[PDB]
Design an enzyme around this catalytic site. Structure first.
Site, PDB file in Angstrom:
ATOM      1  N   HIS A  55       0.846  -1.187   0.000  1.00 24.95           N
ATOM      2  CA  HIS A  55       0.000   0.000   0.000  1.00 24.95           C
ATOM      3  C   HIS A  55       0.886   1.243   0.000  1.00 24.95           C
ATOM      4  CE1 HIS A  55      -3.433   2.411   2.198  1.00 24.95           C
ATOM      5  NE2 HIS A  55      -3.044   2.977   1.071  1.00 24.95           N
ATOM      6  N   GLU A 129       0.709   8.013  -3.734  1.00 26.05           N
ATOM      7  CA  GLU A 129       1.533   7.628  -2.577  1.00 26.05           C
ATOM      8  C   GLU A 129       2.805   8.428  -2.545  1.00 26.05           C
ATOM      9  OE1 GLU A 129       1.157   5.661   0.149  1.00 26.05           O
ATOM     10  OE2 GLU A 129      -0.981   5.612  -0.387  1.00 26.05           O
ATOM     11  N   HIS A 133       3.607  11.125   0.436  1.00 31.85           N
ATOM     12  CA  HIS A 133       4.575  10.527   1.386  1.00 31.85           C
ATOM     13  C   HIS A 133       6.019  10.574   0.932  1.00 31.85           C
ATOM     14  CE1 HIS A 133       1.356   8.911   3.902  1.00 31.85           C
ATOM     15  NE2 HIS A 133       0.772   8.440   2.815  1.00 31.85           N
TER      16      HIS A 133
HETATM   17  N1  LIG Z   1      -1.613   6.928   1.821  1.00 32.50           N
HETATM   18  C1  LIG Z   1      -2.592   7.299   2.693  1.00 32.50           C
HETATM   19  N2  LIG Z   1      -2.351   7.312   4.047  1.00 32.50           N
HETATM   20  C2  LIG Z   1      -3.416   7.740   4.956  1.00 32.50           C
HETATM   21  C3  LIG Z   1      -4.698   8.207   4.460  1.00 32.50           C
HETATM   22  N3  LIG Z   1      -5.404   8.574   5.578  1.00 32.50           N
HETATM   23  C4  LIG Z   1      -4.600   8.323   6.689  1.00 32.50           C
HETATM   24  N4  LIG Z   1      -3.380   7.832   6.303  1.00 32.50           N
HETATM   25  C5  LIG Z   1      -2.189   7.399   7.076  1.00 32.50           C
HETATM   26  O1  LIG Z   1      -2.233   6.170   7.823  1.00 32.50           O
HETATM   27  C6  LIG Z   1      -1.203   6.210   8.841  1.00 32.50           C
HETATM   28  C7  LIG Z   1      -1.424   5.323  10.083  1.00 32.50           C
HETATM   29  O2  LIG Z   1      -2.492   4.409   9.782  1.00 32.50           O
HETATM   30  P1  LIG Z   1      -3.970   4.624  10.418  1.00 32.50           P
HETATM   31  O3  LIG Z   1      -3.869   4.145  11.942  1.00 32.50           O
HETATM   32  O4  LIG Z   1      -4.223   6.218  10.335  1.00 32.50           O
HETATM   33  O5  LIG Z   1      -5.261   3.877   9.726  1.00 32.50           O
HETATM   34  C8  LIG Z   1      -6.505   4.321  10.377  1.00 32.50           C
HETATM   35  C9  LIG Z   1      -6.776   3.722  11.728  1.00 32.50           C
HETATM   36  O6  LIG Z   1      -7.214   2.387  11.409  1.00 32.50           O
HETATM   37  C10 LIG Z   1      -8.082   4.292  12.156  1.00 32.50           C
HETATM   38  C11 LIG Z   1      -7.654   5.257  13.274  1.00 32.50           C
HETATM   39  O7  LIG Z   1      -7.584   4.612  14.558  1.00 32.50           O
HETATM   40  O8  LIG Z   1      -8.680   4.943  10.998  1.00 32.50           O
HETATM   41  C12 LIG Z   1      -7.832   4.847   9.830  1.00 32.50           C
HETATM   42  N5  LIG Z   1      -8.060   5.776   8.663  1.00 32.50           N
HETATM   43  C13 LIG Z   1      -7.777   5.399   7.383  1.00 32.50           C
HETATM   44  N6  LIG Z   1      -8.029   6.371   6.446  1.00 32.50           N
HETATM   45  C14 LIG Z   1      -8.534   7.412   7.137  1.00 32.50           C
HETATM   46  C15 LIG Z   1      -9.041   8.778   6.839  1.00 32.50           C
HETATM   47  O9  LIG Z   1      -9.053   9.190   5.641  1.00 32.50           O
HETATM   48  N7  LIG Z   1      -9.472   9.559   7.854  1.00 32.50           N
HETATM   49  C16 LIG Z   1      -9.484   9.164   9.159  1.00 32.50           C
HETATM   50  N8  LIG Z   1      -9.963  10.057  10.049  1.00 32.50           N
HETATM   51  N9  LIG Z   1      -9.060   7.930   9.567  1.00 32.50           N
HETATM   52  C17 LIG Z   1      -8.541   7.024   8.555  1.00 32.50           C
HETATM   53  C18 LIG Z   1      -0.658   7.637   8.939  1.00 32.50           C
HETATM   54  O10 LIG Z   1       0.771   7.666   8.999  1.00 32.50           O
HETATM   55  C19 LIG Z   1      -1.314   8.418   7.775  1.00 32.50           C
HETATM   56  O11 LIG Z   1      -0.511   8.990   6.751  1.00 32.50           O
HETATM   57  C20 LIG Z   1      -4.818   8.187   2.977  1.00 32.50           C
HETATM   58  O12 LIG Z   1      -5.894   8.560   2.432  1.00 32.50           O
HETATM   59  N10 LIG Z   1      -3.781   7.730   2.206  1.00 32.50           N
END
Ligand SMILES: Nc1nc2c(ncn2[C@@H]2O[C@H](COP(=O)(O)O[C@@H]3[C@H](O)[C@@H](CO)O[C@H]3n3cnc4c(=O)[nH]c(N)nc43)[C@@H](O)[C@H]2O)c(=O)[nH]1
Length: 245
Positions: A55, A129, A133
């Site tokens: 991903h 991506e 990032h």
């Molecule tokens: N490439 C990419 N990374 C994303 C996106 N949204 C969030 N991230 C990233 O994911 C990373 C860590 O993973 P996460 O813990 O945030 O995954 C999530 C986690 O499962 C849970 C939080 O406890 O919700 C999720 N989660 C996944 N996508 C989203 C979103 O668009 N908005 C919100 N508010 N939450 C989202 C961060 O470093 C950050 O960059 C996206 O659209 N694209």
């Protein structure tokens, strides 16, 4: 070649984000929103571990960025596009193809698309991506995407990957998933992993692993990981989703 940030290099970790892709096409059958010219392949491979795909590789919040009032939430939401810095143009999850072409070699793009269904074509996941990032760091696109490909292969080849393959279609415990991960990398590193699921019963959709930034260019080993505070939303037991949504 090695992955190296040319600017904003002052972060402590990368998050390797892997999709249990069987739930990357089942998820948009649960919520029902959109399908893509990727899951159409329906190619039942041979190695069930190969349903684990790349991903992303997401740097953590750079210190120079945090210093200007940027918090974790904002960094996670916008990455390279955060304000006041690095303030690159916001990549749009809808039209990933309108982000800059990454300039990756034809070898790299080949190897990438084998493990990243959404890469290239009319999907351009890799453009999105890189924009969110990678671009602000000046990462060489070939080292960046070659690195995430290598890391995914290392996971797939580990006891965690073997675990997924052996339990294809089965309901597993977080306890047993953790023990498999621990068999390869040790119990002290089990917390470097966050699992995401969808549905009730929960079915696996994503694996995110926190890696020390200084260990990124080495094969994974006991010293590569950073425990983090979120085990994820899968609960005690969950399904290793099969393909055929
Ligand atoms: N490439 C990419 N990374 C994303 C996106 N949204 C969030 N991230 C990233 O994911 C990373 C860590 O993973 P996460 O813990 O945030 O995954 C999530 C986690 O499962 C849970 C939080 O406890 O919700 C999720 N989660 C996944 N996508 C989203 C979103 O668009 N908005 C919100 N508010 N939450 C989202 C961060 O470093 C950050 O960059 C996206 O659209 N694209």
């Amino acid at each position: 070649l090695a992955l190296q940030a040319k600017q904003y290099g002052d972060f402590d970790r990368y998050v390797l984000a892997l999709s249990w892709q069987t739930g990357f096409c089942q998820s948009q059958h649960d919520r029902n929103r959109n399908e893509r010219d990727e899951c159409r392949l329906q190619t039942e491979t041979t190695n069930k571990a190969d349903f684990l795909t790349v991903h992303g590789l997401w740097p953590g919040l750079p210190k120079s960025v945090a210093a200007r009032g940027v918090d974790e939430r904002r960094w996670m939401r916008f990455g390279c596009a955060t304000r006041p810095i690095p303030n690159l143009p916001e990549a749009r999850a809808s039209r990933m193809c309108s982000s800059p072409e990454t300039g990756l070699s034809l070898e790299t793009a080949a190897k990438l698309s084998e493990v990243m269904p959404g890469a290239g074509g009319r999907s351009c996941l890799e453009r999105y991506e890189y924009a969110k990032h990678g671009a602000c760091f000046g990462f060489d696109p070939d080292a960046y995407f070659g690195t995430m490909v290598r890391l995914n292969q290392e996971i797939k080849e580990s006891e965690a990957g073997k675990f997924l393959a052996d339990n294809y279609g089965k309901t597993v415990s977080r306890r047993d998933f953790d023990a498999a991960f621990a068999k390869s990398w040790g119990k002290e590193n089990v917390k470097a992993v966050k699992l995401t699921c969808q549905g009730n019963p929960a079915y696996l959709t994503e694996i995110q692993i926190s890696i020390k930034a200084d260990a990124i260019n080495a094969p994974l080993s006991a010293n590569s990981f950073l425990p983090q505070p979120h085990p994820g939303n899968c609960g005690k037991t969950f399904v290793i989703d099969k393909a055929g949504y």
